[PDB]
């Protein structure tokens, strides 16, 4: 009865963001084909404004984020390391992505821009991919590196994460430390979006394929197991992949999305409108959880 809201299946993976992709993998592993809908959407089309979002029709609840989604639908060193890696992936591993594929114009605009365009409506790609690039450029801070013999720094900033994720035994029946059933999906999502894309300017693919055999094998096995031939067999919306965004397909809705996005960018009266809109949407979200704001 639940209904997800994710990105597009562009890269051959059901999303182009590790959060919603991992949510999709989790739902596919735990629920069953006859429970969810995987409605494709965009961030501006949900009250949460955070894309991976559940919608449980039993009580009409909006639940943004991935950890809050897995909060619903639910020795001790196992779960302790589970939480530890759940928090270590959401930071220092998402900014390792955004060091490529989202900030470097040499790599963003050759595979990422058409991928984003092929999942959005007609007039919207004007404004939202800029917001997402700004977001991933903010997250890629605290790293000292930007769009760029100044190459060893890349190898170092990649090892400082792949070595922590290395001695983990991310998918098997025995080894170093078995983590959990949930966070494995998150690691799959992040390592997939770190390895699988076509990436016309690759610098992570060679490092991974030539230094960490466990990561490549883990990603390939997890993709071939639960996501057959691009995950098109997943229970997408009634129509199809592109036909998924039918609940917000009216020209009026897309026009409203575009005009909000452009009005929230004017010099001076933009910040106030953005704050007011975010406040109203959060009030709506809280009212969806049976709460009572002012």
């Amino acid at each position: 009865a639940v209904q997800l809201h994710v990105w597009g299946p562009a890269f051959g993976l059901p999303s182009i963001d590790a959060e919603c992709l991992a949510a999709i993998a989790y739902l596919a592993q735990t629920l069953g084909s006859a429970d969810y809908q995987l409605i494709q959407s965009s961030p501006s089309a949900v009250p949460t404004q955070h894309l991976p979002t559940l919608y449980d029709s039993r009580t009409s609840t909006w639940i943004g984020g991935f950890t809050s989604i897995t909060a619903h639908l639910h020795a001790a060193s196992a779960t302790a390391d589970g939480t530890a890696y759940t928090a270590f992936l959401s930071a220092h591993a998402a900014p390792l992505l955004a060091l490529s594929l989202y900030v470097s114009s040499a790599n963003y605009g050759a595979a990422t821009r058409p991928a984003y365009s092929a999942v959005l409506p007609l007039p919207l790609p004007w404004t939202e991919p800029p917001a997402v690039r700004a977001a991933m450029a903010r997250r890629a801070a605290h790293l000292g590196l930007s769009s760029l013999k100044s190459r060893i720094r890349l190898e170092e900033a990649a090892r400082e994460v792949l070595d922590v994720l290395a001695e983990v035994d991310w998918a098997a029946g025995g080894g170093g430390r078995q983590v959990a059933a949930e966070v494995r999906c998150l690691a799959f999502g992040y390592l997939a979006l770190m390895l699988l894309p076509d990436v016309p300017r690759p610098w992570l693919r060679e490092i991974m394929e030539g230094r960490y055999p466990a990561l490549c094998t883990f990603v390939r096995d997890f993709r071939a197991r639960v996501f057959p031939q691009g995950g098109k067999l997943l229970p997408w919306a009634d129509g199809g992949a592109q036909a998924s965004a039918s609940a917000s397909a009216s020209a009026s809705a897309v026009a409203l999305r575009f005009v909000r996005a452009v009005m929230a960018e004017v010099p001076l009266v933009g910040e106030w409108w953005s704050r007011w809109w975010t406040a109203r949407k959060k009030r709506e979200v809280l009212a969806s959880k049976g709460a009572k704001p002012a």
């Binding site: 959060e19 302790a80 390391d81 939480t83 530890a84 270590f88 997402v132 959060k282």
Partner: protein, 308 residues
Amino acid sequence: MQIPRPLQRLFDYFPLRIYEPNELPERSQQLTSGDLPTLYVFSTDSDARLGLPSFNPGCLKWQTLLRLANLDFRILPSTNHSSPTGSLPFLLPPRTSPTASPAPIPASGLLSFARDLDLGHLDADLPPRAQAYLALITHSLRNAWLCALYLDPTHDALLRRLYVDPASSSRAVRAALLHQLRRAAAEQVATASSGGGKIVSLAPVDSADGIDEEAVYRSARDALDALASLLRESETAWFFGTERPGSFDAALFSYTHLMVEYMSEETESAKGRVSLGRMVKEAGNGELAEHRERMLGVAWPEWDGYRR
């Protein structure tokens, strides 16, 4: 074609009677006289004389690390604008002459100036599993501290009496300072995806409605449980089987001490959200409060009166 400067060589010798220096003013002879290195933190004015812990977890870590390193220094309050970088906890060596002071030492090199026997246990490459938790402290508990202190109307008095009272002593400036503080806090907490990664127009979400006051608190509670479960595998009352506490114990103490001290009040108890101090005291069976109280036995042995 660059030739040297004029070579007439008669411009010199003109300064006739070079007299004695100019005897720096009053407000630069008491605040900067100095007999020992002078660490600058967010401490109070009374606490600065005895060396009590600060109330900024970014400076309590370095203050604790330096006290563990068997270094004798002073503590003076500051206001975060006077620092080689943007962040405050920097150190200043003492003066060699009343008209010269060596270069400041920022927060990234304090434990390099502190070297007397073995300063290796305080800055070393952690085990690969250790960072998996050192990222659990700096990114979940930090966002909890922020969202609880700055963006919580129940903790308005605490913020207003810690951060904006010793700043201006004027109302119309206190207001703008509080606003800038809360804006920077909401912007810094709304970046780590544990709290909220809402996507708006091309400007970070600096508002009390970008994050949600549920996910941060829940991730903080999970982080405290995981840290307690890691501590219960110690056998030496310190995290990684080490006799003397290193950088990890100090990094955790920085937040644990303040969460037990300031945000640890008993009010209605119906709101559901229990103060972070209670979560620290209840994580596991009390394994974190005991670690905290043991940290005040290698750092502040001559002090008493904590827990509130």
